[PDB]
Amino acid sequence: FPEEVDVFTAPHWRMKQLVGLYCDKLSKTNFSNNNDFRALLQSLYATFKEFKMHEQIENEYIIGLLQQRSQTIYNVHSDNKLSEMLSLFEKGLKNVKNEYEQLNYAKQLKERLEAFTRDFLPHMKEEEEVFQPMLMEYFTYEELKDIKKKVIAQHCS
Ligand SMILES: [Fe+3]
Numbered sequence: 702f703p704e705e706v707d708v709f710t711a712p713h714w715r716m717k718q719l720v721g722l723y724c725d726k727l728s729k730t731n732f733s734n735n736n737d738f739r740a741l742l743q744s745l746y747a748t749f750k751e752f753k754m755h756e757q758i759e760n761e762y763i764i765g766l767l768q769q770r771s772q773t774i775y776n777v778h779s780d781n782k783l784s785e786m787l788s789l790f791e792k793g794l795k796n797v798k799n800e801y802e803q804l805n806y807a808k809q810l811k812e813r814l815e816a817f818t819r820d821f822l823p824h825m826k827e828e829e830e831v832f833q834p835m836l837m838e839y840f841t842y843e844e845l846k847d848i849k850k851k852v853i854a855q856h857c858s
């Protein structure tokens with residue numbers, strides 16, 4: 702699809718970049734070290750807040766408009782359980798007070814992150830492969846242009 706009407710690719714390039722960055726940070730992190738431990742969680746909190754902002758932009762600028770056009774039932778824009786990821790990081794930041802707890806938390810963190818990435822990648826792909834075509838259907842080219850302009854502006858603060 703022409704870039705000027707593609708509402709998912711550019712934002713997703715950033716989202717995928719972020720995924721790579723936290724996977725690298727995660728694998729390099731020494732969960733036995735308190736400072737290393739809190740820095741990763743801080744980074745993760747920021748990263749997933751950006752994810753949360755990304756999903757919100759889509760809900761407010763794309764999904765809502767699209768749904769008020771067709772009304773003829775769903776795909777829904779899935780949650781990805783971002784609030785639950787953010788809640789996890791918070792517990793690690795407020796509740797973990799020693800190395801035993803850091804290492805027990807780590808196993809759960811890795812589990813949950815892997816599962817998240819496992820839900821996030823198909824999620825983005827579905828937007829690109831299913832929602833985008835739908836947009837071309839229910840909106841004119843210029844209407845879609847206008848939507849993308851707002852979407853990209855929101856991602857560029
Ligand atoms: Fe999304």
Ligand SMILES: [Fe+3]
Pocket residue numbers: 709712713755759825828
């Ligand atoms: Fe997306």
